[PDB]
Amino acid sequence: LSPADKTNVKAAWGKVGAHAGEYGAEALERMFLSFPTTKTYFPHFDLSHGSAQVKGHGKKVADALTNAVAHVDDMPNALSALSDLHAHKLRVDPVNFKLLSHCLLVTLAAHLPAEFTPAVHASLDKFLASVSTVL
Amino acid sequence: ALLKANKDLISAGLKEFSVLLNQQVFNDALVSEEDMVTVVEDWMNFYINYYRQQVTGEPQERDKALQELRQELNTLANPFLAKYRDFLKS
Ligand code: HEM
């Protein structure tokens, strides 16, 4: 992530992530549909009885990206750390973690046709793919 | 011969599409060939649905600009898919 890449993320998320917190259940669904594979196991959110958890969850994703994006300079391992938490403690496979980010970016492209620009998507995709561990 | 406006528009999306494609770090995919296709097609659907509001002119030329774009987006995506395809065996 170059000094310029970081400036683009803040801009990108600034103008497009304001309502990201409202797209939990939808990004999850896009994943289940576009990527059926992730649907065979999924013992998360107790979907059988709800939408409350994936909904609340969708809020955490937005809040986390907001905090993570606001701190790309000082806390470069925010996403990395978050991803490890899921992979190692929450039983969430790094690919589902990566796919939900994709389906979240897709949702936003749906709900914001003139804000979600190609450059806005590349600037966010680059940040989201920076989930390795930085040093 | 489609329009000096949409002519460049289509060129922009292909440049933007390349920086997107070119910044991809394969060691960080863990996605199957099958899903990588899905991802890329979503990225292309994305660009099309985007420039669908950017194309200018009359319906005839409208659908014409988009159709050329998608034709080109594929031309860039194909080498991408192939290289990534050759990331399995290796
Ligand atoms: C787009 C990427 C994602 C981001 C940014 C994200 C972010 C978060 C955050 C910030 C939390 C709260 C962590 C804490 O307790 O401190 C959380 C919890 C959780 N996440 Fe994710 N997550 C993502 C994808 C996923 C996926 C794909 C799944 C799989 C279904 C998942 C399942 C869970 C579960 C089960 C919890 C515990 C939820 C709870 O009870 O609050 N996450 N996530």
From Swiss-Prot, chain A:
Effect of P94T: In Godavari; O(2) affinity up
Effect the entry attributes to changing Y23H: In Luxembourg; unstable
Effect the entry attributes to changing N67K: In G-Philadelphia
Impact reported for D63Y: In Persepolis
Reported impact of L47R: In Montgomery
Effect of S130P: In Questembert; highly unstable; causes alpha-thalassemia
Recorded consequence of changing D5V: In Ferndown; O(2) affinity up
Phenotypic consequence of S83R: In Etobicoke; O(2) affinity up
Stated name of the protein: Hemoglobin subunit alpha
One GO CC annotation: endocytic vesicle lumen
UniProt-reported outcome of changing A114D: In J-Tongariki
GO molecular function, one term: oxygen binding
Effect of L124R: In Plasencia; family with moderate microcytosis and hypochromia
Positions contributing to heme b binding: H86
Effect of D5N: In Dunn; O(2) affinity up
Function comment: Involved in oxygen transport from the lung to the various peripheral tissues.
Similarity field: Belongs to the globin family.
Source organism of the structure: Homo sapiens (Human)
Effect of mutating R30S: In Prato; unstable
Residues with the Phosphoserine modification: S2, S34, S48, S101, S123, S130
Curated annotation (Swiss-Prot), chain B:
InterPro entries the record matches: A_Hb_stabilising_prot (IPR015317), AHSP_sf (IPR036468)
Expression sites (tissue/organ): Expressed in blood and bone marrow.
Keywords linked to the UniProt accession: Chaperone, Cytoplasm
Pfam family, one: AHSP
Gene Ontology BP annotations: erythrocyte differentiation; hemoglobin metabolic process; hemopoiesis; protein folding; protein stabilization
Gene Ontology molecular function: hemoglobin binding; unfolded protein binding
SUPFAM superfamilies the UniProt entry points to: Alpha-hemoglobin stabilizing protein AHSP (SSF109751)
Induction: By GATA1 during erythroid maturation.
Subcellular location: Cytoplasm
UniProt keyword Transport, yes or no: no
Family matches, as Gene3D superfamilies: AHSP
GO cellular component assignments: cytoplasm; hemoglobin complex
Functional summary from the UniProt entry: Acts as a chaperone to prevent the harmful aggregation of alpha-hemoglobin during normal erythroid cell development. Specifically protects free alpha-hemoglobin from precipitation. It is predicted to modulate pathological states of alpha-hemoglobin excess such as beta-thalassemia.
Entry's family note: Belongs to the AHSP family.
Assembly: Monomer. Forms a heterodimer with free alpha-hemoglobin. Does not bind beta-hemoglobin nor alpha(2)beta(2) hemoglobin A.
Protein name as annotated: Alpha-hemoglobin-stabilizing protein
Organism listed in the record: Homo sapiens (Human)
